[PDB]
């Protein structure tokens, strides 16, 4: 949300900016999942370095690659794929059931690449990331078109800094917002276990009243006077 800077890469750039930008791109678009050296796309980043494609075109190529499909598409329900795609390509969570219906129909009709295009050719992607900056999780700060459920739902989709969106869990790759979006509910705000040691002396509920052990009763003038 705050500490990591927004990685931007214009067409003229030096070596360290390029290498760091690719590190950030792979650490975001591919979940937090490890991408082995046999999976790194060399032609795609040659095209990025030359300036044939922007960062947005590179993101499109990466989301259409089989690293992305194998992790987030081929072992998933479409609900999970849509959740992940929103998180990883728009930086937010699905707001409505209408988005899931729209994207499911779009994939069923026109196939996977048109779906990735709708994610990356959207006016919201261009508003927040344009062509130069890597996507980032953006619903942890209030932006103009946010909705009340976005914070909770993204926080539900975000598993911490050391978590990842891996298909290699023993439970597999499962949708976690498939029920909350249909009911139009918020998301779960239960954070990892490593964090119950942070700022334990804060007292947000300071105004809360402790109840008495027994309620005050009036035997004569009635009981609630």
């Amino acid at each position: 949300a705050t500490e990591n800077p927004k990685v931007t890469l214009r067409a003229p750039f030096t070596s360290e900016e390029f290498q760091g930008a690719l590190y950030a791109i792979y650490r975001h678009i591919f979940g937090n999942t490890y991408v082995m050296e046999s999976e790194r796309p060399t032609t795609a980043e040659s095209q990025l370095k030359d300036g044939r494609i922007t960062v947005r075109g590179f993101i499109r190529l990466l989301a259409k690659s089989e690293v992305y499909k194998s992790r987030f598409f081929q072992k998933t329900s479409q609900n999970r794929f849509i959740e992940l795609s929103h998180k990883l390509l728009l930086g937010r969570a699905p707001y409505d059931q209408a988005e899931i219906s729209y994207h499911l129909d779009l994939w069923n009709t026109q196939g996977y690449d048109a779906e990735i295009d709708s994610y990356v050719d959207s006016e919201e992607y261009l508003d927040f990331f344009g062509e130069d900056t890597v996507p980032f999780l953006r619903d942890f700060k209030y932006q103009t078109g946010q909705q009340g459920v976005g914070y909770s739902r993204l926080l539900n989709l975000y598993d911490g800094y050391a978590g990842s969106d891996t298909d290699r869990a023993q439970s597999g790759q499962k949708a976690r917002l498939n029920g909350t979006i249909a009911q139009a509910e918020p998301g779960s705000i239960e954070r990892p276990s490593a964090l119950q040691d942070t700022w334990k002396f804060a007292n947000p509920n300071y105004r809360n009243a402790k109840p008495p052990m027994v309620k005050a009763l009036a035997l004569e003038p009635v009981d609630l006077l």
Binding site: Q74, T76, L104, A175, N178, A182
Partner: protein, 172 residues
């Protein structure tokens, strides 16, 4: 995604051993009946609109409450969603039939489908009935003798029924 071959390989790798001769002969069988499997898959693919149409007609003759106002297949949006789901389930059944393994259906189509349908408000019993009707319609085309050399395909019929039954049981 797994087929019979990759499934046998993964099982063998789990114990860190080569593929036994028994496994190789089973896979050689599967390969030899591969052509019958291909004809089964083609029958499912090519007759899909007819399968789904017959299934829809039967289902919405039995269950009027779906297509009434307040039913879950009432407006064109919901009815289109119904037919779309039926075609997607049939598609994944055919994928699994070609694969010889049911893992694609479980991983993709049925992963959390019951929770999805419960969330949306869909009668999962009606979805299971639609899948059973699709199975009944599909067996008719799977057994079509025309346009193919005569032979034995009883195992393939049992396998297709197995994948349809898996889908129906997982949904409801």
């Amino acid at each position: 995604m797994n087929d019979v071959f990759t499934r046998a390989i993964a099982q063998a790798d789990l114990k860190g051993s080569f593929l036994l001769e028994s496994d190789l002969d089973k896979l050689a069988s599967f390969a030899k009946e591969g052509v019958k499997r291909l004809d089964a898959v083609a029958a499912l693919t090519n007759n899909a609109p007819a399968i789904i149409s017959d299934a829809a007609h039967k289902l919405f003759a039995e269950q009027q409450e779906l297509i009434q106002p307040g039913g879950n297949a009432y407006p064109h949006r919901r009815m289109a969603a119904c037919l779309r789901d039926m075609e997607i389930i049939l598609r994944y059944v055919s994928y699994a039939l070609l694969a010889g393994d049911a893992s694609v259906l479980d991983d993709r189509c049925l992963n959390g489908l019951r929770e999805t349908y419960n969330a949306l408000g869909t009668p999962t019993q009606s979805v299971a009935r639609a899948v059973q009707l699709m199975k009944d319609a599909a067996m008719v085309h799977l057994k079509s003798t025309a346009n193919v050399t005569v032979g034995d395909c009883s195992s393939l019929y049992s396998e297709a029924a197995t994948y349809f039954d898996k889908a129906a049981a997982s949904i409801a």
